[PDB]
Structure 1
Amino acid sequence: DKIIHLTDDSFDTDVLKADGAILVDFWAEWCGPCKMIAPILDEIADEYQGKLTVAKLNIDQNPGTAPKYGIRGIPTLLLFKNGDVAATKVGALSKGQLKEFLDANLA
């Protein structure tokens, strides 16, 4: 619904050319922690509408994008502000932990 579903072709447009903040989630289907945080990312899209947009890129279906941001470990949450990484979070975390990360880097 409110979450952008990225591909390798849509990443520049959806992410790098966006006028505002976008939380990108680099994930895969076999990754248990990625699946842990997925419903938390749905809640965050709701609570932070007007402040931020959530986007997801699946690194198996789209294998070109991840090695440009040096990703070696999933889930990796990267926060962008007009196309530049502001903040990096590696591994699973809770709703409250993710909020705290957002509130402090939304800045």
Structure 2
Amino acid sequence: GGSVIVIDSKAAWDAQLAKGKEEHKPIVVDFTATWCGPCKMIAPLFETLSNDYAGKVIFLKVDVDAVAAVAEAAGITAMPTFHVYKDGVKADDLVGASQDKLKALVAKHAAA
């Protein structure tokens, strides 16, 4: 629908990071899992934020169990974990289900 893009493979992962680099837009990733309770609780917000920032920020969702290769490379240990990517590299992160911190993180990078 143009909101959250579900990553299903490493190939998709690489294509999306490249997209952020080509469009010069920051990417915010939600590393989650079906067994993660707090992840289930913050997902509604991540989606809303994706509607609120459509066109300014690209939102990706990675199910760690479904795409182990990306999860491992990303260095994930606790859920949920949020990463910000710019020009193809990790630029910032947030770990935990803090709604107030998630909002601040997105707003911060939506700017400059």
TM-score (structure 1 length as normaliser):
0.89
Question: CA deviation digits over 1:73-106, x for unaligned, max 9?
Answer: 1110001112111111001011x43221122234
Q: Does 1:55 align with 2:39?
A: no
Q: Find the aligned partners of 1:67 and 1:61 in 2 and give their Cα distance.
A: 12
Question: CA deviation digits over 1:40-94, x for unaligned, max 9?
Answer: 0111011111210111010111111011121111110001112111111001011
Percent identity of the aligned residues? Answer: 35
Q: Does 1:27 align with 2:7?
A: no
| 1:34-73 correspondence runs (5 A) | 34-73=39-78
The 4+ residue runs of structure 1 with deviation greater than 6 A are none
Q: Find the aligned partners of 1:58 and 1:33 in 2 and give their Cα distance.
A: 14
Question: CA deviation digits over 1:6-43, x for unaligned, max 9?
Answer: 02231000124423211111110010111111110111
Q: Find the aligned partners of 1:23 and 1:41 in 2 and give their Cα distance.
A: 10
Q: Find the aligned partners of 1:23 and 1:86 in 2 and give their Cα distance.
A: 10
Q: Does 1:100 align with 2:101?
A: no
- The gaps in structure 2 that reach 5 residues or longer are none
1:54 partner letter: F
> Would you say how many aligned residue pairs link Structure 1 and Structure 2?
106
Measured on the aligned residues, the alpha-carbon RMSD in Å equals 1.4
- The gaps in structure 1 that reach 5 residues or longer are none
> Which deviates the most, 14-23 or 29-38?
14-23
TM-score (structure 2 length as normaliser):
0.86
The structure that is helix-richer by fraction is 2
1:70 partner letter: G
